[PDB]
Amino acid sequence: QVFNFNAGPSALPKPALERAQKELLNFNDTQMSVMELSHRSQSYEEVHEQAQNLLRELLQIPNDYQILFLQGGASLQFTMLPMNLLTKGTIGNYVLTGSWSEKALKEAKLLGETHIAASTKANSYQSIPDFSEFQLNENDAYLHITSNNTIYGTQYQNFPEINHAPLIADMSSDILSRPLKVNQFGMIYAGAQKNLGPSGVTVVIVKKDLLNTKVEQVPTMLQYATHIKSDSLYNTPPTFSIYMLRNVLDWIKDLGGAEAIAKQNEEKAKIIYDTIDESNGFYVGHAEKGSRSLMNVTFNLRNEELNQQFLAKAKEQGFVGLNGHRSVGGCRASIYNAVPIDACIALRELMIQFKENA
Amino acid sequence: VKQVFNFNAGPSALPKPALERAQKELLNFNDTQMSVMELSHRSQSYEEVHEQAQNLLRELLQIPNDYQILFLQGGASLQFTMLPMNLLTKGTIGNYVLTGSWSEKALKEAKLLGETHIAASTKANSYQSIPDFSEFQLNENDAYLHITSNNTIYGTQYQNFPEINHAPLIADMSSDILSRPLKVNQFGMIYAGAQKNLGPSGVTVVIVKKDLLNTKVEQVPTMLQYATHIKSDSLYNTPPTFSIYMLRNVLDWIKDLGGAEAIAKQNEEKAKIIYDTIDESNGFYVGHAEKGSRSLMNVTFNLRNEELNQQFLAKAKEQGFVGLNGHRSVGGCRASIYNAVPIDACIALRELMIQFKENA
Ligand SMILES: *Cc1c(COP(=O)(O)O)cnc(C)c1O
Ligand SMILES: *Cc1c(COP(=O)(O)O)cnc(C)c1O
Ligand SMILES: [Cl-]
Ligand SMILES: [Cl-]
């Protein structure tokens, strides 16, 4: 009777939460909660390391990348990245594919010279721009993309070959929804709360030799080098959030890893997109078909009265989270890894019944 | 199986009722059929928890209505830089009172951003005491005066606070916030990582006078402006929802036991058990702190030599004591006795200390 389509924080795998509940008072035979452990304890250090190792195995992260667990959300990364890499005489180059891309660019502008490599803003971010359109500069500090544009419902189907400067990706809303060639990136970051666990930890996967050096004048907490050198234990980490991340990663592994999860995600997205496409225009997706997200499906009915009726009916029927962001309007169905296919089927059935009764 | 005596210095022991409450409803919070961890931060169910945590803090510490309460990420360590970024301006001075390692860390971050000054320091005395307030060297263009209420590593604590009216008084209260009543109106801003006395790690509480920290900050990154978080009620970006939920649960527990005065009475009793054991030990245990600056939250002490220190800590670990190893700067032992550390663990520590001395 409850279908959780929340856009972040979001649904977690039942086994990960059940495991957490079962041992909440007695973690790993210590007779205390994981939340009561010192981050300097062997018990916690084992979890911290396992979470890293699971990420490394599941995404096939090369040995010369470091995995960091940071606080502050993806939003703090919007500023921390340019603080570390946008040096005088270089350019923070951005590909704009939605609202989250804009937020990232805005923070770089406060700190240095920026540039727009490509943008689909003028077309309401309905698509990912062709890579052949990208305007690249010899003095780029990096090229920043947003892999999944959570608000607009578009997603990179693949990633550009970028080697004049590091490619940086905000993968908050699609990290570990599919396999990745990590070597294509200088850095990947993601708040955990969309696809990896609860909120309060941000995963940063970074090429060590890019960022393992002290940057002059940058506050200690805001240097990647601080966290690299200290293995994300410079100050007190968000221990429960990291524990929950570990639990989620174990679930992904148990189901067969990134390939298996990608297959599930493709199947459940098809359920919703086919419903849109067969609706004779009653439901219209915001994204161009070739840029459709497998993680956030955005669509509208023919006018706002119909949008309101639909969302009111959905709320009455137990659906949570379906209201679209204002820039897109309509409905957003967030279908991250842990959202079950039966919830997607229920959404289809709701959509079909609503059209029939309109 | 070993008994548990949790003297961890941060993260730390939690109240059992708060954990039990969390466990019971972990899969279905407030009849939503979702964990609190699975809710939108813009849902009514989560907003109620967020607001309740603020209201409990406000009631328990008697925070005046013209103060705002923020829930931020990054730890107290991020506050070390965020504070001077927002208040340390050209032509002003970040003035610090140094009473331990945490004071030094705060000063260090301000130095990167502007002019700083040391109002007073007990560094030369190995941080064994809180300086006399008469020693404070103050400047007309201080942007603020910063203190560390409880010096977690050294085991000293402000017994009362200075009357400062020339500039804002700012305090890192990470390791003693809500261990006792507090006159909040004496401060412009108070911050604390939650993980010593308020909850689990992952959230930092900032109590700030509304009129104070959100001006002349155009050059400061969005996330690092207090103004951003003030305006959005700590929902600008996604908050650490489960940490704030757990904080709410801990605060309810404090309220249920009688509030700040009741917890201060418990804490004074706990500390007395340990300090009396040290003082009665004919030098077998020696406290780091001068008696008049002793912390009620972190009790620091050494045995006569490193071999005995090691043997004592090994015996402690065998008997189920967790977290007693001192920080390297004092060596020895540190018994952290935050709000939720039970008096019976202090009883157990005393018994261990008496037995170890008698068997040495
Ligand atoms: C939600 C989201 C963010 C912001 O994450 P916070 O952790 O709330 O700062 C950034 N980028 C994308 C793509 C998102 O979906
Ligand atoms: C632990 C502590 C800190 C550091 O807190 P983090 O949350 O680890 O950054 C700062 N000040 C005091 C007094 C502390 O005890
Ligand atoms: Cl977006
Ligand atoms: Cl200290």
3-state secondary structure labels for all residues of chain B: CCCCEECCCCCCCCCHHHHHHHHHCCCCCCCCCCCHHHCCCCCHHHHHHHHHHHHHHHHHHCCCCCEEEEEECCHHHHHHHHHHHHHCCCCCEEEEEECCHHHHHHHHHHHCCCEEEEEEECHHHCCCCCCCHHHCCCCCCEEEEEEECEECCCCEECCCCCCCCCCCEEEECCCCCCCCCCCHHHCCEEEEECCCCCCCCCCEEEEEECCCCCCCCCCCCHHHCHHHHHHCCCCCCCCCHHHHHHHHHHHHHHHHCCHHHHHHHHHHHHHHHHHHHHHCCCCCCEECCCHHHECCCEEEEECCCHHHHHHHHHHHHHCCEECCECCCCCCCEEEECCCCCCHHHHHHHHHHHHHHHHHC
Task: Kindly provide the b/e burial profile for residues A101-116, where b requires at least 16 CB atoms within 10 angstroms of the residue's own CB.
Answer: bbbbbebbebbbbbbe
Q: How far apart, in whole angstroms, are the C-alpha atoms of residue B156 and residue B79?
A: 21
Q: How far apart, in whole angstroms, are the C-alpha atoms of residue B319 and residue A356?
A: 69
Q: Which of A18, A76, A220 sits opposite B223 (nearest CB)?
A: A76
Same-domain check for residues B139 and B217 = yes
List the structure tokens of B23. 């466990």
Give the length of chain B: 360
Residue type, A251: W
Q: Which residue is listed with tokens 């200390």?
A: B353
Residue A166's CB is within 10 A of a number of other CB atoms, namely: 20
Taking each helix axis as running N to C, give the angle between helix B75-87 and helix B101-111, from 0 to 180 degrees, rounded to the nearest 10: 40
Task: Kindly provide the b/e burial profile for residues A183-221, where b requires at least 16 CB atoms within 10 angstroms of the residue's own CB.
Answer: eebbbbbbbbbbbbbbbbbbbbbbbeebbeeebeebbbb
Q: How far apart, in whole angstroms, are the C-alpha atoms of residue B98 and residue A328?
A: 53
Same-domain check for residues B24 and B106 = yes
Considering A225, A255, A285, which residue would you say is the last residue of a domain?
A255
List, as own/partner pairs, every contact residues B180-183 make where C-beta atoms lie below 8 angstroms and the sequence separation is at least 24, other chains included: B180/B260, B180/B261, B180/B263, B180/B264, B180/B267, B180/B296, B181/B61, B181/B62, B181/B260, B181/B261, B181/B264, B182/B61, B182/B62, B182/B260
Same-domain check for residues B239 and B288 = no
Are the CB atoms for B271 and B298 separated by under 8 Å? no
Are the CB atoms for A348 and A356 separated by under 8 Å? no
List the structure tokens of A161. 């070959």
A98 CA closest ligand 1 atom index:
13
Same-domain check for residues A31 and A147 = yes
Q: Which residue is listed with tokens 């050294």?
A: B154
Using a CB-CB cut-off of 8 Å, the residues of chain A touching B236 are 75
Distance of CA B149 to the CA centre of its chain: 8
What residues does B141 pair with on adjacent strands? none
Are the CB atoms for A271 and A348 separated by under 8 Å? yes
| A74 annotated as ligand-binding | yes
Residue type, A319: F
CA nearest neighbour of B93 among B113, B109, B116: B116
Distance of CA B144 to the CA centre of its chain: 20
Region for A31 from its dihedrals, namely left if φ exceeds 0, alpha if ψ lies in -120 to 50, beta otherwise: left
Q: What is the β-pairing status of strands A167-170 and A140-146?
A: parallel
Could you tell me the strand order of the sheet in which B333-336 lies?
B286-287, B298-302, B333-336
Same-domain check for residues A200 and A114 = yes
Q: How far apart, in whole angstroms, are the C-alpha atoms of residue B53 and residue B48?
A: 9
**CB B68 near ligand 2, within 6 Å:** no
* Number of domains observed in the structure of chain B: 2
Q: Is residue A52 part of a domain?
A: yes
Nearest chain B alpha carbon to A15 = B27
Same-domain check for residues B33 and B175 = yes
Q: What is the β-pairing status of strands A65-70 and A202-207?
A: antiparallel
Please tell me which residue in B102, B142, B176, B253 is annotated as part of the active site: B102
Residue type, A296: N
User: B38–A11: do the CB atoms touch at under 8 Å?
Assistant: yes
List the structure tokens of B210. 């509304």
Q: How far apart, in whole angstroms, are the C-alpha atoms of residue A135 and residue A116?
A: 8
Are the CB atoms for B177 and B224 separated by under 8 Å? no
Domain containing residue B330: 258-360
Domain CATH for B63 = 3.40.640.10
User: B219–A110: do the CB atoms touch at under 8 Å?
Assistant: yes
Experimental technique of record: X-ray
Phi–psi pair at B270, nearest 5 degrees: -60, -50
Distance B125 CA to ligand 3 centre (A): 56
Region for A23 from its dihedrals, namely left if φ exceeds 0, alpha if ψ lies in -120 to 50, beta otherwise: alpha
Same-domain check for residues A217 and A302 = no
Same-domain check for residues A136 and A277 = no
Q: Which ligand is nearest to the CA of A97?
A: 3
Q: Is residue A220 part of a domain?
A: yes
Give the length of chain A: 358
Distance A100 CA to ligand 3 centre (A): 5
Considering A237, A255, A273, which residue would you say is the last residue of a domain?
A255
| A75 annotated as ligand-binding | yes
A75 CA closest ligand 1 atom index:
9
Q: Which ligand is nearest to the CA of A188?
A: 1
List the structure tokens of B274. 């340990």
List the structure tokens of A73. 């959300």
One-letter-per-residue 3-state SS of A95-142 = EECCHHHHHHHHHHHHHCEEEEEEECHHHCCCCCCCHHHCCCCCCEEE
- For residue A4, give Cα distances in angstroms to A7, A9, A195, A260, B32: 9, 10, 13, 22, 10
Q: How far apart, in whole angstroms, are the C-alpha atoms of residue A282 and residue A130?
A: 29
Q: Which ligand is nearest to the CA of A154?
A: 3
CA nearest neighbour of A149 among A130, A168, A171, A164: A171
Phi–psi pair at B286, nearest 5 degrees: -125, 125
**CB A272 near ligand 1, within 6 Å:** no
Taking each helix axis as running N to C, give the angle between helix B306-318 and helix B343-359, from 0 to 180 degrees, rounded to the nearest 10: 130
Residue B178's CB is within 10 A of a number of other CB atoms, namely: 25
Q: How far apart, in whole angstroms, are the C-alpha atoms of residue B138 and residue B170?
A: 14
List the structure tokens of B196. 């010593």
**CB B238 near ligand 1, within 6 Å:** yes
Q: Is residue A8 part of a domain?
A: no
| B141 annotated as ligand-binding | no
Q: How many CA atoms lie within 13 A of A274 on its CB side?
A: 10
| A130 annotated as ligand-binding | no
Are the CB atoms for A92 and A72 separated by under 8 Å? no
Q: Is the peptide bond before B15 cis (omega within 30 degrees of 0)?
A: no
**Active-site annotation of A, residues:** 100, 170, 194
Q: How far apart, in whole angstroms, are the C-alpha atoms of residue B329 and residue B320?
A: 25
Q: How far apart, in whole angstroms, are the C-alpha atoms of residue B212 and residue B170?
A: 11
CA nearest neighbour of B176 among B268, B105, B246: B268
Q: Is residue A3 part of a domain?
A: no
Q: Is residue A7 part of a domain?
A: no
Same-domain check for residues B145 and B161 = yes
Domain CATH for B343 = 3.90.1150.10
Q: Is residue A170 part of a domain?
A: yes
What residues does A323 pair with on adjacent strands? A331
Tell me the structure's resolution in angstroms, rounded to a single decimal. Answer: 1.6
Q: How far apart, in whole angstroms, are the C-alpha atoms of residue B26 and residue A19?
A: 11
Distance B330 CA to ligand 4 centre (A): 10
CA nearest neighbour of A174 among A202, A205, A195, A193: A195
Considering B257, B282, B304, which residue would you say is the last residue of a domain?
B257
Q: How far apart, in whole angstroms, are the C-alpha atoms of residue A252 and residue A260?
A: 8
Q: Which residue is listed with tokens 């939650």?
A: B194
Q: Which of B26, B80, B238 sits opposite A9 (nearest CB)?
A: B238
CA nearest neighbour of A340 among A14, A16, A59: A14
Same-domain check for residues B253 and B266 = no
One-letter-per-residue 3-state SS of chain A = CCEECCCCCCCCCHHHHHHHHHCCCCHHHCCCCHHHCCCCCHHHHHHHHHHHHHHHHHHCCCCCEEEEEECCHHHHHHHHHHHHHCCCCCEEEEEECCHHHHHHHHHHHHHCEEEEEEECHHHCCCCCCCHHHCCCCCCEEEEEEECEECCCCEECCCCCCCCCCCEEEECCCCCCCCCCCHHHCCEEEEECCCCCCCCCCEEEEEEHHHHCCCCCCCCHHHCHHHHHHCCCCCCCCCHHHHHHHHHHHHHHHHCCHHHHHHHHHHHHHHHHHHHHHCCCCCCEECCCHHHECCCEEEEECCCHHHHHHHHHHHHHCCEECCECCCCCCCEEEECCCCCCHHHHHHHHHHHHHHHHCC
Are the CB atoms for A217 and A230 separated by under 8 Å? no
**CB A353 near ligand 2, within 6 Å:** no
Residue type, A207: K
Distance B153 CA to ligand 4 centre (A): 4
Same-domain check for residues B217 and B346 = no
Are the CB atoms for B240 and B253 separated by under 8 Å? no
Q: Is residue A9 part of a domain?
A: no
Q: How far apart, in whole angstroms, are the C-alpha atoms of residue A331 and residue B17?
A: 40
Region for A122 from its dihedrals, namely left if φ exceeds 0, alpha if ψ lies in -120 to 50, beta otherwise: alpha
Same-domain check for residues B195 and B232 = yes
End-to-end CA distance of chain A: 23
List the structure tokens of B290. 């001068």
Q: Is residue B327 part of a domain?
A: yes
Q: Which residue is listed with tokens 């039942």?
A: A14
Q: What is the β-pairing status of strands B286-287 and B298-302?
A: antiparallel
